[PDB]
Amino acid sequence: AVDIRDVKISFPGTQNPKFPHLRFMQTLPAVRQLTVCQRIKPFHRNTGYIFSCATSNQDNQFITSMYVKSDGTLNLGLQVNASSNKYISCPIEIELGQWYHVCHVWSGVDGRMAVYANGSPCGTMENVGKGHQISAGGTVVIGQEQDKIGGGFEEQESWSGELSDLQVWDEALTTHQVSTVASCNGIRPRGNVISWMEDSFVADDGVIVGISHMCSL
Amino acid sequence: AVDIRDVKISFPGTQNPKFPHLRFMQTLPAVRQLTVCQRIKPFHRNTGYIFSCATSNQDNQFITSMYVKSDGTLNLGLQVNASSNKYISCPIEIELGQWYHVCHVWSGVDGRMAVYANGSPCGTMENVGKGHQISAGGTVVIGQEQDKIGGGFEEQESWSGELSDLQVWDEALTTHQVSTVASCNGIRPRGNVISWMEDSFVADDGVIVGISHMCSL
Amino acid sequence: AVDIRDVKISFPGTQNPKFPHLRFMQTLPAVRQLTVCQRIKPFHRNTGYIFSCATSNQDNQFITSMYVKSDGTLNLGLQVNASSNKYISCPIEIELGQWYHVCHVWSGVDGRMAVYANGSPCGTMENVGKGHQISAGGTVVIGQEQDKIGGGFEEQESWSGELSDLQVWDEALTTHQVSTVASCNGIRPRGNVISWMEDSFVADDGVIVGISHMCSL
Amino acid sequence: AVDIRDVKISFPGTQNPKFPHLRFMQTLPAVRQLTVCQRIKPFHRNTGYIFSCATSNQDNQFITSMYVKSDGTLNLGLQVNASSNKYISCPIEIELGQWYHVCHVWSGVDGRMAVYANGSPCGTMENVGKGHQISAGGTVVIGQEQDKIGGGFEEQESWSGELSDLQVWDEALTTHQVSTVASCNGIRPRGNVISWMEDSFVADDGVIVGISHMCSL
Amino acid sequence: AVDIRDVKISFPGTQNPKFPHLRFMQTLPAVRQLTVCQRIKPFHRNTGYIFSCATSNQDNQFITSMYVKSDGTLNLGLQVNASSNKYISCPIEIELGQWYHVCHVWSGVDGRMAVYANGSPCGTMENVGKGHQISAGGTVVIGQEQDKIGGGFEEQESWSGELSDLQVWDEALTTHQVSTVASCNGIRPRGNVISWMEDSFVADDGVIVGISHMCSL
Amino acid sequence: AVDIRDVKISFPGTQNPKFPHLRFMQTLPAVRQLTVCQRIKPFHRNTGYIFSCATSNQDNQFITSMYVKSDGTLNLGLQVNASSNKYISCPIEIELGQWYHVCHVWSGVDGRMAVYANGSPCGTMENVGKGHQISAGGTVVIGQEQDKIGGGFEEQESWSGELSDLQVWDEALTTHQVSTVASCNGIRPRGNVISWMEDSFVADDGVIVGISHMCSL
Amino acid sequence: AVDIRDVKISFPGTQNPKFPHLRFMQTLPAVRQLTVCQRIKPFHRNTGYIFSCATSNQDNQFITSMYVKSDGTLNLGLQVNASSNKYISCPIEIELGQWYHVCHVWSGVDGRMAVYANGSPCGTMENVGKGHQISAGGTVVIGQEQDKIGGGFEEQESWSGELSDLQVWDEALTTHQVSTVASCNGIRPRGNVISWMEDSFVADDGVIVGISHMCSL
Amino acid sequence: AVDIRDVKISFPGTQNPKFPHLRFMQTLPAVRQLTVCQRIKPFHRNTGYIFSCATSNQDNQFITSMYVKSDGTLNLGLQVNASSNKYISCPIEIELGQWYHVCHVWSGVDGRMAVYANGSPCGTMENVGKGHQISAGGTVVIGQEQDKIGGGFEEQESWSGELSDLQVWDEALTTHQVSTVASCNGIRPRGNVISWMEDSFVADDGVIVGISHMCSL
Amino acid sequence: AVDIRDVKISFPGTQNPKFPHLRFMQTLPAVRQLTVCQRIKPFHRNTGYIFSCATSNQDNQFITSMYVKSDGTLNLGLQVNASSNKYISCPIEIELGQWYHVCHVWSGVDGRMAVYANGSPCGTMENVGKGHQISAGGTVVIGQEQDKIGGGFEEQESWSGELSDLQVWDEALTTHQVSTVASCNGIRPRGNVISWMEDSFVADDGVIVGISHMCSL
Ligand SMILES: [Ca+2]
Ligand SMILES: [Ca+2]
Ligand SMILES: [Ca+2]
Ligand SMILES: [Ca+2]
Ligand SMILES: [Ca+2]
Ligand SMILES: [Ca+2]
Ligand SMILES: [Ca+2]
Ligand SMILES: [Ca+2]
Ligand SMILES: [Ca+2]
Ligand SMILES: [Ca+2]
Ligand SMILES: [Ca+2]
Ligand SMILES: [Ca+2]
Ligand SMILES: [Ca+2]
Ligand SMILES: [Ca+2]
Ligand SMILES: [Ca+2]
Ligand SMILES: [Ca+2]
Ligand SMILES: [Ca+2]
Ligand SMILES: [Ca+2]
């Protein structure tokens, strides 16, 4: 009946010392490219970090984030190897509490960054982590921004809302491929690095496990 | 590929002030009967409480527990409306770290208690909560014993190990029905009160979300 | 998913002035024979009337009842045209709170009465309403005994428990046919006089609408 | 043959001390969003409350209602956390005694309210329960307006007519999803909070259980 | 081979003391709406009553009739609670001896009357039995007009011809639903109040039982 | 759903001037053999004539009958060309009100008579209408014995009970063929002379049209 | 392989005392309407009678005939109750030796006559046997005109050619229905009064039994 | 529905000058072997000739016949090229009016004759038309014995009864093959010389065309 | 793999005393119409007779022939009852050595002749054997013209080439039917008089048996 890809996690809200988050048990391998796709229902307009990857020597190896502009426009950001946050605007009005499919595509081979909203390209940006290779052993945390491996969280950088169908590949997916990932009734692909609910993660500080009805009612 | 019924939660180990546990978001309705079935992989021989249900006036409405005797024999216990713990031994040697299907069947209509290990009856006991009806609004916690709604946990009463496929019905399932519930390749029924991964729950204090390989490799 | 034949009604318990019951909206046609089959989960051992049919001139046209003997043996009774209650014992131990399929077969053509438990014949009795034809316009009430059309209920004659799959035919089904009616995975026949959930009925005094798990979990 | 989703309940008419209604046995979990969809056949033009949710400290947590304007236009109302009733008109002429699919979509995350008639959007309204989260333990009553948990009904606020296929989700369904819910020959989705005939409810004061022929004859 | 819905009854012709007719064995439940559909082959142009429903205190609860105007136009009439006969003309030329599908839709909730010929709407009429509810226990006679329960027939009000596929619902079917009922190769729906050949009836005064070839040759 | 072969006719009881019966519209062709099979539920033990065939010059061309002996044994009789009634006893105890399949096989070619109960041979008799050929134009009446074409009925020769699946062939079916006719879940053959519900017949004096549940519930 | 509906009979030619013909063994029931359809291959242009029905008091109850006009146009005639022959011309050129589907539709209810050639309407005629009902017991002869039951044939009124697929109904088929009867690859319907090769008939005076290749080669 | 192989012909009885018979339109080719199989229902015990083949110079080329001995035993005869009749008795009691499958196998190559009853071998005979080859142009008549091509019939040599499924091969079928021919539910083979209803024949002197119910009811 | 309908016979060339030909073993029945269709590959332009039918008193009962005009145009001829050869030109250029489907349609009923090339009509001719009926017993020879039964061949009238799929019916097929016969991928019909390779024939004077690749390679 209910597919495992539709399981969702709710990140209630953050307030020191409570930081709802997930931390994947297995560290990532070294990667030269990364595509992070997932379904999200944001609870606030201000900036929040969703996917955070940190190594012993670099707490900011790869970090995705978002925020909603005053006009309701979605802004997707990416930070690689402690670079400044690179933002790309998406031509879609965000209604807090509604579901959206978001994907960040990064390639250190050519330094190209691209983001997608609901399976459609929002635009690209050059010189983002160009020539950079994320060293092996990266620890992934969801919902909080790491300043130390698995910790050093800050409430102003947390992301509250609901998340599901997190899929990560160590390749830079094409525009066409991202649309096949977003499709609710599509093949619903599984990442080779992280496949939602197939790669163990620690749940802490009151996250809520439930079901997402973005695709199936 | 992977069925949502095979999702598992690991309860690492308890040590104040850390109490890994789950708390279901929705309270239970009033019930005169209850059957709690689930797959478990115990980490220790000493007594631990698995399913704990509490109301404002009675923190001990319904509590399941287990422990392994010196000879390796499984003992399943039940406590209803603050009664003493009633234990029924099962003719099966327990190996910590291995999977077992356990089910507790309770009927307040006739006061009969029955427990099952791997789909087979271990025995029954009379006068357990006879004539008792669990009042509406019971809060369910997994892995810890409540002394207060959603809290008042005690390390000596915690249960560590892995749990999956939790199914709860507000009826007293028959011996034959329990065997159809336990079967790995059977129909894998879903409880009408609580259906694993279909009824939201809060995850806290470091529980680990993963996949159970008791049934499917 | 869930079949309408598995919908159940719970009759909580009776205490003046509260009499949980059902009353069918349409009166029955004249009949010379009647077979009443249904799934029941009794809450008490003392006598209770399940199916009650009354006309303006005869509040006791056809009434089914049951009670459990001291040894746990099931006793099924029938009363036709204000006759005395005729009881036939069934070779099955009743556990209050458990499901059982019960059927009463009556034929006014030859005056024969026969009852069945879980699809098996318990025995027969002669001279029960022999030559009697239930006059047209009978009102059917479930869970209470009528002393007046749709009323005049008495607490000591009420039946508490859960009921489901009520099927009524204006024929006297054979022993073989009743076994095909009882089978949980059988064709699950629908009565031509009353078909569960296909013939409207008034629900009153706190009956609970839910699902029966006697057949499907 | 007949699907459980087509079972209907008739609310005859209210007159103190008789208040036909349904009360769900299980209280709701805490929610920040809610979508209530159902098929209704109204018996009167004046205002009536259909879905009423109340907690110990707030009898008016969430209440749906409707009324027909002088020109026959349908007006759908919603009240959250004791706010005033917010009404949105639907471009459809109502004929008392005819079936219509109605749905109320509420999101406390952004405070947006939206209503649908026969699967089509009627319009939206801002600032309805914005930032409000319905506290856990809400009791749901159908057909009457609660002034106390499960009671305190008032004849002038009751709703008479026929109701079927009640489905409730703790999410704010999109315009497209509501159309898939309304379709008679569609997938006929089941709510995750309340699924018609899958979540027990008490029937009282003469409600009539029957079959709806809005979709299947 | 031959479906039961195609069985037909021929009403030869009436002449005191012979009144060919059918009388259903079971009385109807109370209804606030009624839809009567059937296939008919009229033998005469003058007015004849087809469906007659009577209670102890009202011999004219619900009566359908028809007649052919001078120009061959079909006129369908309805009388509710002893009101005057309300007629609606149908844009179809009637050839005595030919088959036609006729349906009468009545709603006491809004007092709306609508008739259909061969699955197409002929028109509607307001204020027909508005607010009227047919009391329970109505006796249905086909082919004759009752002035007394099951009798008091009058030759000048009888209807001669062939009739088949009589289906009655206690709801006011929509225009679209009536077209699905009329279709010869459609689903051929069965009424919930009266389903042709599934609800017993007395045949008297020389009616002829045969097969209708309106739909299948 | 319901097959036309399961339609049944009830012959309530006879009392001058009321003689419930059926009369086939079409006369039979000349035949030198005849097999009459049907399902019957007898209401009385005394002799009654079921199938009566008469021509202008011979009201007793072919007549079937039955009666139950004191010990409950079934006796099947046949009369051809005004011969005396020939009876053959069947090894089966008859319970009034129960269904039985009965068939009469007659061959004027060799003058052999054979009867069957529930598809099994009861025995045979020689010299019954040997060399006799039923002249063309025979009128068939069911439930009454003709002393004149379509009339001259006598209450003491009437047959009361329920009848269904009447099949007549102008051949003398073999013992094996009769068993294939009786089988409830068999091919359910249709006679070439008279096929139940496919050959028109007049219904008179209050016969009741309904459904037989001998084979399908 | 070969369907029974394609069996054909050849009427060689008539010359006293030889009159090739068929005579149905069973007489017809009383009818107020009649539709006679069949496939024919005419051997001559002059008038010939195909279907002849006679009763003791009326040798000309119903008679069909045809003839080819000088320009090759087909003329179909009908005579009812000894009326004069009514002819309707068909817009089709007849080639002796070729197959054609012909059907005569008659309704005594309204006195309308209609004929069809190859499934298409040729026209209609009023006042043909209006109000007339063919009395029961009509004997049918094919290929000759009866002046006496089964005889009194006249060579100048005989019809020579090949005939197949004779289907007769006691209803007045519609224009659309006749087209479905004529279609060679259609459902090939069977009449309820006479079904080709399913209703026995005497063959006499040298008719030839063979196969028709009008539809299947 | 009805297969052409089940069409039957009835030979009523012979009485000069009336000789019911069939004569095949096409003469046979020269053959050195012949197998004649068919289903028959005999009307008399005395000798009758069924299949008669004659050429200009030999009216007795091949003739089959039968008769029933005093003890009811079937005797099958064959005559080839004016030889004396050769009889082989079959171990089966014949009941006039019942169906039997009979087959005659002849081989002029070795002069062997073999007959079968109901698919079983009755025995063989040597020196029957040994070395004889039936000359080309043989005319086949059924039911009468030819003394001249297509005529010269004699009442005392006629065969009365019913016949169906006549199949003729110009080969000497084996014992096993004859059993596959006789089987009612088998492949029902068609002869290469004469295939029932596929080879034209003249019907004369009152034969009756109908349907055989030996195999299908 | 290879269908019997594609078997071909090659007629090498004729030179006294060698006359390659085929002679069918069985003579034809009497016919009033005849259609002869077959596939041919001609080896010469001069006239040749393909199908020759002769009786004792008429060696020229029915004869088909062809020849190619100077411009390459195909001419098809027919002779009936010793009439002169009637020729109809076909709008197709013939290439000796190539395959063509040819069919001759003759009707003695109206005296019409029609020929077809490759399934298309070439034209018709009147007064060809009008009123003539080919007497029974005709012997068919292929490839030579008979002046005596099965002989009297003349080299100047022989036909050389390849022939296959010879199909003969005793009916006059329509234009449409001939097109369905010619189609290589069609149903490939089989004549009822002569079916290629299903009706035995003598092969003599060096004909060559092989396979035709006109339709299947
Ligand atoms: Ca950081
Ligand atoms: Ca930080
Ligand atoms: Ca506690
Ligand atoms: Ca504790
Ligand atoms: Ca009483
Ligand atoms: Ca009482
Ligand atoms: Ca309130
Ligand atoms: Ca209130
Ligand atoms: Ca009246
Ligand atoms: Ca009146
Ligand atoms: Ca008599
Ligand atoms: Ca009598
Ligand atoms: Ca005449
Ligand atoms: Ca005449
Ligand atoms: Ca002879
Ligand atoms: Ca002779
Ligand atoms: Ca010649
Ligand atoms: Ca020559």
CSV table of C-alpha atoms in Angstrom, one decimal, chain G residues 8 12 41-43 95-99 211-214 217, chain I residues 32-33 109-110 112 169 171-172 174 177 180-181 189-190 192:
chain,number,residue,atom,x,y,z
G,8,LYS,CA,-30.7,-23.6,-46.1
G,12,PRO,CA,-37.0,-26.6,-56.4
G,41,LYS,CA,-32.6,-16.4,-52.9
G,42,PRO,CA,-35.6,-16.1,-55.3
G,43,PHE,CA,-35.9,-18.2,-58.5
G,95,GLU,CA,-31.2,-10.4,-59.5
G,96,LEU,CA,-32.9,-13.9,-59.4
G,97,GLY,CA,-30.4,-16.3,-57.9
G,98,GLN,CA,-28.8,-13.8,-55.5
G,99,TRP,CA,-29.2,-13.6,-51.7
G,211,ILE,CA,-25.8,-24.8,-46.7
G,212,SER,CA,-26.2,-21.1,-47.4
G,213,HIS,CA,-23.1,-19.1,-48.5
G,214,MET,CA,-24.7,-15.7,-48.3
G,217,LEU,CA,-18.1,-18.9,-47.8
I,32,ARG,CA,-28.1,-24.3,-61.1
I,33,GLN,CA,-25.2,-22.1,-60.3
I,109,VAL,CA,-31.1,-18.9,-62.6
I,110,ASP,CA,-30.8,-15.6,-64.4
I,112,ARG,CA,-25.7,-14.1,-65.9
I,169,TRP,CA,-19.1,-23.4,-55.0
I,171,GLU,CA,-23.7,-20.7,-55.8
I,172,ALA,CA,-23.1,-17.5,-57.7
I,174,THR,CA,-21.1,-11.8,-55.3
I,177,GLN,CA,-17.2,-12.3,-52.0
I,180,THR,CA,-12.4,-12.0,-50.2
I,181,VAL,CA,-11.6,-15.3,-52.1
I,189,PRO,CA,-12.2,-19.8,-48.3
I,190,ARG,CA,-12.9,-23.4,-49.4
I,192,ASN,CA,-18.4,-26.5,-50.9
